[PDB]
Write a protein that binds this ligand. Structure first.
Ligand SMILES: O=C(O)COc1c(C(=O)O)sc(-c2cccc(NCc3ccccc3)c2)c1Br
Length: 298
C-alpha cells in the first residue's frame, strides 16, 4: 500500500536506494535507428533515445525518425507520447507527429530557457498576427488565444494541413515553474495543472495520445505521466490500494528509458498520487483547494 510504504521509505530516508532499485530493474532495449548517423542532428541528447519498438514513426519515406516514444499503458487503457523538446530543425517533424497521431493536447513541462541554456526551440507562435509555416512538413500553426495564469499558460492553436487544408484545434498546456531535475511547487499546483489538462478532454481515448515533453522528455514528463496513469488505474478500480507505483513506473520504462530522473521526483509522484486519490474516491472538494492553493490567479 502506497501511503504506508511512503511513510517507511520516508522514515528510513531511503528514497535514493528505492529509486536506484528501479534504475537497476529497468528495461533495456535497442535504439538503433535513433543512433543512425543521419539522425544525429535529430537528437537533443546523445544519451536519451527512443527504443526502436516503441518509437513514433513520421509518415514520410525520406526519414521517419523523431525522438519520441509511444507509452501505451495497456491495463490503464491510456497512451501518451513522450518526446524531447523540438530542436530548431525538428519543429516540422514535431507538428507532423501531432497531426499524424491525431493528438489534441500538448503538455510542455519546461521553459524555452533554463539555467542559461536553450532546452527547447520556439516551436509555437507567440502572437496571433505572426503564424508559423513549416515548409518541410507542409503545416501551418496559428496562435488563436491564450489564458495565462501565475505558473502555467494554456494556449489555443489552430494547426492546418496545407496539403488538404484540413484544420484542427490543439490545446497547449505550458507548466512554467517546474525546475529541471526538480519537482513542482506542491502536490496542489501539480494536480491543479493535471486536472486542467484532464478537463480539456485532451486525454480522451477518442483522441490520439496526448504529447508530453520537457527538454529530454523523460524526467518531468516521466513524473507527469506516472502520476496520471496511477490515478487512472486507481479510478478504474476505485481502489487506491490496488496500485503499485513502482511496478507502474517499471512498466512505463518498457516504452521509454529513464522516466523520472531523481529520487525526489519519484517521492513527489507518490505525494501527487496520494493527494489525487482523495478526489478519485469521492472528495470532489479537494479540487477547489488545489486551485486556491496553486495561486494561479496572481
Ligand atoms: O526533466 C527533467 O527533470 C530533467 O531533464 C533533463 C535535462 C534538462 O532539462 O536539461 S538534461 C537530461 C539528461 C541528458 C542526458 C543524460 C541524462 N542522464 C542519464 C540517463 C539517460 C537516459 C536514461 C537514464 C539516465 C539526463 C535530463 Br533527464
Amino acid at each position: 500500500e502506497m501511503e504506508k510504504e511512503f511513510e517507511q521509505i520516508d522514515k528510513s530516508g531511503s528514497w535514493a536506494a528505492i529509486y536506484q532499485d528501479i534504475r537497476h530493474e529497468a528495461s533495456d532495449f535497442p535504439c538503433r535507428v535513433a543512433k543512425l548517423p543521419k539522425n544525429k542532428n535529430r537528437n537533443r541528447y546523445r544519451d536519451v533515445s527512443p527504443f526502436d519498438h516503441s518509437r513514433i514513426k513520421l509518415h514520410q519515406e525520406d526519414n521517419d525518425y523523431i525522438n519520441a516514444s509511444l507509452i501505451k499503458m495497456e491495463e490503464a487503457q491510456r497512451s501518451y507520447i513522450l518526446t524531447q523538446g523540438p530542436l530548431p530543425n525538428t519543429c516540422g517533424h514535431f507538428w507532423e507527429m501531432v497531426w499524424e497521431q491525431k493528438s489534441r493536447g500538448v503538455v510542455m513541462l519546461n521553459r524555452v530557457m533554463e539555467k542559461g541554456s536553450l532546452k527547447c526551440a520556439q516551436y509555437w507562435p507567440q502572437k496571433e498576427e505572426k503564424e508559423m509555416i513549416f515548409e518541410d512538413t507542409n503545416l501551418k500553426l496559428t496562435l488563436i488565444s491564450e489564458d495565462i495564469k501565475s505558473y502555467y499558460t494554456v494556449r489555443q492553436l489552430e494547426l492546418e494541413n496545407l496539403t488538404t487544408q484540413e484544420t484542427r484545434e490543439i490545446l497547449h498546456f505550458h507548466y512554467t515553474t517546474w525546475p529541471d531535475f526538480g519537482v513542482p511547487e506542491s502536490p496542489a499546483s501539480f494536480l491543479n495543472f493535471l486536472f486542467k489538462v484532464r478537463e480539456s478532454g485532451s486525454l480522451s481515448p477518442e483522441h490520439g495520445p496526448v504529447v508530453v515533453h520537457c527538454s529530454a522528455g523523460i524526467g518531468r514528463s516521466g513524473t507527469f505521466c506516472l502520476a496520471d496513469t496511477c490515478l487512472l488505474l486507481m479510478d478504474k478500480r476505485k481502489d487506491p490500494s490496488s496500485v503499485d507505483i513502482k511496478k507502474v513506473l517499471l512498466e512505463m520504462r518498457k516504452f521509454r528509458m529513464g522516466l523520472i530522473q531523481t529520487a525526489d521526483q519519484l517521492r513527489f509522484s507518490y505525494l501527487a498520487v496520494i493527494e489525487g486519490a482523495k478526489f478519485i474516491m469521492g472528495d470532489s472538494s479537494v479540487q477547489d483547494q488545489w486551485k486556491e492553493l496553486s495561486h494561479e490567479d496572481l
